[PDB]
Amino acid sequence: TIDLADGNYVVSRGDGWILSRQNQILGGSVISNGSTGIVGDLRVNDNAIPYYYPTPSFNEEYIKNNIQTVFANFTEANQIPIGFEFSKTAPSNKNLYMYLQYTYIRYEIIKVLQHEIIERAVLYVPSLGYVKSIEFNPGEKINKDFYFLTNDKCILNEQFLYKKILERVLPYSNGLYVINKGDGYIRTNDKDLIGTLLIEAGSSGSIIQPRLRNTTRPLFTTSNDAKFSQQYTEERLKDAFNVQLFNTSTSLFKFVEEAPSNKNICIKAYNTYEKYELIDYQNGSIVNKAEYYLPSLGYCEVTNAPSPESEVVKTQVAEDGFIQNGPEEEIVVGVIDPSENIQEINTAISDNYTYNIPGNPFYILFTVNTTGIYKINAQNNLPSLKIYEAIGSGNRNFQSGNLCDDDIKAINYITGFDSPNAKSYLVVLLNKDKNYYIRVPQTSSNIENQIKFKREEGDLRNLMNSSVNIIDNLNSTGAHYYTRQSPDVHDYISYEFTIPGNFNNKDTSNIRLYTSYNQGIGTLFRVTETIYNLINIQQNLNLLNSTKSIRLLNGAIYILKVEVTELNNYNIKLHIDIT
């Protein structure tokens, strides 16, 4: 013809192509007096035979492979059976004839030389269907053209989609996360298009997934099939949200549109996915990542019916990829590492409990007897611990003063650090009817350690939901900094430090307290210990590159609690500069 650019091209001429001569080869219904006729079909293996019209340059295999590279793979989609139907209601005291015809997507392979198409192979792939209806009287003459098409024709507007044939800081604790990135995900270039129905004005039209076969094709990518295999990811999905069926479904979706009396209507259906990510996060880095696109329940676009004789505007294909047509969603859900054993405290912790550690990382499942602030630590505050909440423990099986296991592997990090040589203790509000997981990290000592739990009825409640770092051995002048994993916005980190010198209760020293990268509100306490009381000294201290200085009593213990208000870096570096 006359086109543009030299070489071979794969082209999608669009959906809605009906073929010549074979209009009534499926039959039609006659409906009389106000009755509604519903005609439809079910495309499967057998009825989804495509029609190849090759050329010497472009054989069937070449046509197939190149079309399925860029566009919907119709050899796998002829597996999952899809239905459609049309519904016309005859008027009173007059008859109506409607007949059904398959629609096709018309793909082409073209050779272009000097702005001319020299060769064209065509492939018609079965899509859905089109019903045409007429009202008729006994021996009313009907136009031959109503029954019979002499040339291939698109009932929709045609398309010319071609391609030349070349031939963020995550403040997460270390561990596994399963993230729901949302629903309504389709691939580009209609690789997940179900089909299109032209719905004549006054008629009605549906596109159906009846699950006559109970099989779905999830989409799985992984960075390491050894660590994150599909089976493993499915388990994490089970752990995270309790997904059961992955390659199966009993769940039906249908889309239905009734065209008004005055105007025709068009409806396009897609298979969709719900996008999950499984990540392995370590020290600010995604060490492994899989993507699981779980077969969902579809997307449906309803447009007014476009002139079948419109201007065909040629467009180049998009890059392989996804588009979310559903709303935005991020659900981050930690999951118990299955490489890490779970030990159990069968007693609800009341005022005091001491768990003896045999001496490889592990979780400890436990609950409290009474909602309250608990201090938790190992001996000498080494190693550093982490505490997670099992998600949705509350309001199931209960027994006063005893643990009931809900068997929840979905964990919600509260506070704690992954630094086995840094001294810390935890101060957490624990809820009586929840379960919690303590995570004990890997240690290279074989010395019998012990985790200690203590109910705090005092001022240590001000450190609520915080790990407290123990800062040893400040010198009497100069700089000091302390890099740790930053909490998220509005989460907490605390630091317990003793001012240089001997305690006189009069001699002070000039301390400057600030962060380096992240913004934080700092509240400062002075510890006075008889049997911990915290005196609040300043709690309006914004820390990011602060220069403010406050004189603190020498040889006296203080605790700084910091609220992250701007997460600019994975780490939070804390400066304590002394004068």
Ligand X SMILES: CC(=O)N[C@H]1[C@H]([C@H](O)[C@H](O)CO)O[C@@](O[C@H]2[C@@H](O)[C@@H](CO)O[C@@H](O[C@H]3[C@H](O)[C@@H](O)[C@@H](O)O[C@@H]3CO)[C@@H]2O)(C(=O)O)C[C@@H]1O
Q: Does 472 participate in binding a copy of itself (rule CB under 8 A)?
A: no
- For a copy of itself, the binding residue among 9, 62, 74, 99 (CB under 8 A) is 99
Determine the distance from the C-alpha atom of residue 426 to the mean position of all C-alpha atoms in its chain, rounded to a whole number: 32
- Regarding 85 and contact with a copy of itself (CB under 8 A), the answer is yes
CB 119 → a copy of itself: shortest distance, Å?
5
* Residues 223-242 interacting with a copy of itself (rule: CB under 8 A): 240-242
* Closer Cβ to ligand X, 398 or 481, answer by number: 481
Interface of this chain with a copy of itself, residues 44 to 83, rule: CB under 8 A: 44, 46-47, 49, 53-57
3-class SS letters over 403-470: CCCCCCCEEEEEEECCCCCCCEEEEEEECCCCCEEEEECCCCCCCCCEEEEEEECCHHHHHCCEEEEE
Closest to ligand X by CB, 483 vs 565, is 483
| Residue 258: count of CB within 10 angstroms of its CB | 14
User: Applying CB under 6 A, does 480 fall inside the site for ligand X?
Assistant: yes
If binding is defined by CB under 8 A, does position 325 make contact with a copy of itself? yes
Q: Is residue 316 part of the contact set for a copy of itself (CB under 8 A)?
A: no
* Integer Cα distance of 266 and 67 in angstroms: 25
Q: Does 111 bind ligand X (CB under 6 A)?
A: no
| Residues paired with residue 218 on neighbouring β-strands, in sequence order | none
User: Is 315 strand, coil or helix?
Assistant: strand
Residues 28-87 binding ligand X (CB under 6 A) are: none
Instruction: For residue 492, give Cα distances in angstroms to 178, 423, 431.
Output: 24, 17, 19
- Return the range that interacts with ligand X (CB under 6 A); candidates 132-140, 374-382, 479-487, 543-551: 479-487
Q: What binding mask, one character per residue, do residues 401-420 give for a copy of itself by CB under 8 A, x or -?
A: -x-x-x---x----------
With CB cut-offs between 5 and 8 Å by kind, which of a copy of itself, ligand X, none does residue 309 bind?
A: none
Nearer to a copy of itself, 85 or 418 (CB): 85
- Scanning 294-302, 417-425, 440-448, 554-562 for contacts with a copy of itself by CB under 8 A, the matching segment is 294-302
The listed partner (a copy of itself, ligand X, none) that binds 481, CB under 5 to 8 Å by sort, is ligand X
Interface positions, 434-463, toward a copy of itself (CB under 8 A): none
In the complex, least distance from residue 138 CB atom to a copy of itself, rounded to whole angstroms: 6
Neighbours of 411 (CB within 10 A): 28
Task: Give the nearest distance from C-beta 573 to ligand X in angstroms.
Answer: 6
Nearer to a copy of itself, 232 or 497 (CB): 232
**Centroid of chain to Cα 185:** 10
Q: How far apart are CA 288 and CA 134, in angstroms?
A: 61
What's the token pair of residue 485?
């994993």
Binders in 383-422 for ligand X, by CB under 6 A: 419, 421-422
C-alpha closest to that of 94 among 143, 40, 42, 137: 137
Q: Please, which of residues 419-448 interact with ligand X by CB under 6 A? A: 419, 421-422
Alpha-carbon span 176 to 236, nearest angstrom = 9
Closest distance between a copy of itself and the C-beta of residue 343, in Å?
Answer: 19
421 interacts with, out of a copy of itself, ligand X, none, CB within 5 to 8 A per kind: ligand X
Picked from a copy of itself, ligand X, none, the partner binding residue 484 (CB below 5 to 8 A depending on kind) is ligand X
For 44-50, the CB contacts below 8 A with 24+ separation are: 44/78, 44/81, 44/212, 45/78, 45/79, 47/102, 47/126, 48/74, 48/77, 48/78, 48/125, 48/126, 49/126, 50/74, 50/123, 50/124, 50/125, 50/126
- Which residues does 24 contact at the CB level (< 8 Å), separation at least 6? 99, 101, 147, 148
Which of the stretches 64-72, 289-297, 453-461, 553-561 binds a copy of itself when contact is defined by CB under 8 A?
Answer: 289-297
Among 43, 64, 111, 484, binds ligand X (CB under 6 A): 484
Longest Cα separation, the chain: 117
Give the type of residue at 434: K
Closest distance of CB 170 from ligand X, Å: 16
- The span from the CA of 562 to the CA of 565, in Å, is 9
* Site of interaction with ligand X (CB under 6 A): 419, 421-422, 473, 480-484, 573
